[PDB]
Ligand binder design. Structure first.
Ligand SMILES: NC(=O)c1ccc(N)nc1
Ligand SMILES: NC(=O)c1ccc(N)nc1
Lengths: 239, 239
């Protein structure tokens, strides 16, 4: 469709990506051609009898690396399919830390190619010669780049028009039926039908929750007059 | 086995979890009974004809929330299956930010229950009454908690003995065959077979890469004498 997104994926385990292409909001996006996810498996680019996709690191060490030739050939094939303009991304803990601002940046691309490493990762020279950007989804280590790739895909998919049916703050609390749950009642303001009061309450809650849980996030913001007031109110009430 | 881990999962899309239970290192862990992942679907705890799992938020707004009764009943069932000692975790951007230290903390639990929200999330009172800890995998918004749950599972699985076949720094570069790749050569030290020189080179590279890419990570460390020296060397060479 309009701001259709195409994402090429290089992975030894392409079936993992069914988790986003077959279910939920992202599954719908794929079915409706708002999002296309296309996978290439380095194992298909091997030539030896046992289809070897790993190789030993120079200098020794416990682990293995992705074998260069099958991975390189898979990447080249994905690039040829993408045509001009596709940004190639490698997922790793050494990459730029993903946050919502970074998601909105990545979402500007009509085409992405995501390279998923396994084992101890990929040859440094491939990063230099084939990768445009290195990204991390957070400061922790996983068994492979597939979950980070899927996480990135899901996050950017939300910005594709038609996929869905924030302002630097944590979300406010939400309530649904029943009116009373284990003695806990819904805040009366949410029952009032006073849409302006409800708005300000939610905003105040978001400011309070951000202040108590993630105060560093507030330092990155230029609060509006209204937000400054409601935050001061919340801090006074907290005291 | 020994430090076997059991993880209960509450999700509207349990088939997504095949991505970790059927493939790779985590698939092996599950097959070998080092890791058990057990899923309950709130849709199975509905009683109406159309198996409704969402509900309208008090106070209005665009989105929907998880319906309380099916979700609550699924959680209670998972808790009964887990028996005593299981920590219940809700995945959301309002939670404690996951990092490797937090992974090692979570890995100390023999039993976890992971609640995956969809839509605009779950009722605040359920968080108060059913959830022990809220965790986030990073400062970005996804369509549901399943990818964060899987990310958490993968990260903690790596600490289960037998699953695998770091010190605050980014990883060093890695090289494998061929010796020359698009004119780019493997660092001679890695070919030298001098294991002490190789160690120090890798450590120096990790310190240099951490300094250039993530200097804030260094401020959280008490560097060893050796690390202080190699970092000073790298910074001098960089200049
Ligand atoms: N933090 C990450 O984005 C990441 C990427 C790959 C991997 N094996 N582990 C972690
Ligand atoms: N950052 C997170 O851990 C997260 C959890 C749930 C969701 N829908 N989006 C993001």
């Amino acid at each position: 469709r309009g701001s259709h997104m195409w994402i090429g994926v290089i992975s030894l385990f392409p079936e993992m990506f069914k988790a986003i292409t077959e279910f939920g909001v992202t599954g719908r996006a794929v079915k409706h051609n708002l999002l296309k996810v296309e996978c290439w498996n380095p194992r298909d680019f091997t030539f030896d009898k046992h289809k070897t996709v790993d190789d030993r690191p120079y200098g020794g060490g416990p682990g293995m690396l992705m074998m260069v030739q099958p991975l390189r050939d898979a990447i080249h094939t994905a690039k040829a399919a993408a045509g001009e303009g596709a940004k190639v991304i490698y997922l790793s803990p050494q990459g730029r830390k993903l946050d919502q601002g970074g998601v909105t940046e990545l979402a500007q691309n009509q085409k992405l190619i995501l390279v998923c490493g396994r084992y101890e990762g990929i040859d440094e020279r491939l990063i230099q010669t084939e990768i445009d950007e290195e990204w991390s989804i957070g400061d922790y280590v996983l068994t492979g780049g597939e979950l980070p790739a899927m996480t990135l895909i899901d996050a950017v998919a939300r910005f594709i028009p038609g996929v869905l049916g924030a302002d630097g703050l944590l979300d406010c609390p939400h309530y649904t039926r029943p009116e009373v749950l284990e003695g806990l009642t819904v805040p009366p303001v949410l029952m009032s039908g006073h849409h302006e009061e409800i708005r300000k309450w939610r905003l105040k809650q978001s400011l309070q929750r951000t202040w108590l849980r993630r105060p560093e996030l507030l330092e990155g913001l230029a609060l509006t007059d209204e937000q400054r007031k409601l935050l001061k109110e919340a801090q006074a009430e907290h005291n």
